[PDB]
Structures are given as structure tokens and as C-alpha cells.
Design an enzyme around this catalytic site. Sequence first.
Site, mmCIF file in Angstrom:
data_model
loop_
_atom_site.group_PDB
_atom_site.id
_atom_site.type_symbol
_atom_site.label_atom_id
_atom_site.label_comp_id
_atom_site.label_asym_id
_atom_site.label_seq_id
_atom_site.Cartn_x
_atom_site.Cartn_y
_atom_site.Cartn_z
ATOM 1 N N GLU A 35 57.257 38.950 36.353
ATOM 2 C CA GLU A 35 55.856 38.218 36.597
ATOM 3 C C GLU A 35 55.292 37.951 35.175
ATOM 4 O OE1 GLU A 35 54.065 37.377 39.044
ATOM 5 O OE2 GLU A 35 55.100 38.021 40.737
ATOM 6 N N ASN A 46 46.027 28.961 38.725
ATOM 7 C CA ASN A 46 46.813 28.237 40.083
ATOM 8 C C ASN A 46 45.825 27.077 40.409
ATOM 9 O OD1 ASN A 46 48.810 30.384 40.448
ATOM 10 N ND2 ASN A 46 47.147 31.514 40.918
ATOM 11 N N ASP A 49 44.599 26.123 44.155
ATOM 12 C CA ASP A 49 43.841 26.920 44.773
ATOM 13 C C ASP A 49 42.829 27.464 43.920
ATOM 14 O OD1 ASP A 49 44.555 29.617 44.198
ATOM 15 O OD2 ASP A 49 46.347 28.557 44.693
ATOM 16 N N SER A 51 42.514 30.054 41.861
ATOM 17 C CA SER A 51 42.859 31.292 41.609
ATOM 18 C C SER A 51 43.462 31.430 40.329
ATOM 19 C CB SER A 51 43.324 31.954 42.679
ATOM 20 O OG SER A 51 44.700 31.848 42.625
ATOM 21 N N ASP A 53 46.027 34.488 38.322
ATOM 22 C CA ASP A 53 46.821 35.905 38.387
ATOM 23 C C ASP A 53 46.623 36.586 37.004
ATOM 24 O OD1 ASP A 53 47.756 35.223 40.882
ATOM 25 O OD2 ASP A 53 48.979 33.780 40.016
ATOM 26 N N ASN A 60 46.125 38.623 41.876
ATOM 27 C CA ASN A 60 45.469 37.344 42.065
ATOM 28 C C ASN A 60 43.890 37.692 42.309
ATOM 29 O OD1 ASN A 60 44.603 35.263 44.407
ATOM 30 N ND2 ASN A 60 45.961 34.387 43.039
#
Length: 130
Positions: A35, A46, A49, A51, A53, A60
Amino acid sequence: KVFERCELARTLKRLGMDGYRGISLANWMCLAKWESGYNTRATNYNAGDRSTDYGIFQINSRYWCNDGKTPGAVNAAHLSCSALLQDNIADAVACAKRVVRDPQGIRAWVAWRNRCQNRDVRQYVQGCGV
Ligand SMILES: *SC[C@H](NC(C)=O)C(=O)O
């Protein structure tokens, strides 16, 4: 901060992640590795969308932490995403625990499925004293 592999493993054990909801430390380690490369500062936007992380576990902003800028998200009564960018991973661990309390468990992270599930993940903790 960028954690050394063993330094992280011992930290996760202390915070009680070994066997949490059936998840081995080696699995949690495998997850942090793919990750964020064990980097608490890691941030991934992202575009698709809107969002983001955040942190070592790449949590998220739509479902778990509030950053204000994410559309159709959890509100300001929930943990601030900023808390997942700290050097001290206590908040991040407490949040990671919550995420896997869902039926989906660790499978919530697609990177876990690709790179960790049904694999020999002993390498992530070998020689750490955990
Ligand atoms: S994972 C952090 C947690 N988020 C939710 C949605 O419960 C919180 O502490 O607010």
C-alpha cells in the site's frame, strides 16, 4: 516517516494487530508494504471518484476519514484524514481495525488480494523477533 521492516513489525504487535479478526502480523505487513512502502506520509488521489487514500494503510476519505473535499463521504464528526499522516501510527491502527470489522475483512484492500492472499507471507516478518 519511512519505517524499517522490523521496526514496523514490532510496532504493529504492540498495538495488538497480531491475529486481529484472524489477521496475522505477516498479512498486515504485506498490506503496508504494497500500500505505501511503509510510509506514513503516502497519499494517493483517485481522480475518477475524487477520493484520497491516506497514510501507511492507504485509508480512503469517502468511507473512513473526513477530509472535507471528498464528495458523498462520511462527515466531520469522524476522524480527520490528517490524523493518518502522523509519524505515530496509533490512529491509523485504530482505523485499520475498524475497517476489517466489516464482513469483508482485509479483502477491503484490493492490493491485499493481488499481492498477499494465498501467498507465503512469512518473508515480511522473518527475523523481526515477533
Ligand atoms: S476508521 C476511522 C473511523 N471511521 C469511521 C467511519 O468509523 C472513525 O474513528 O471515525
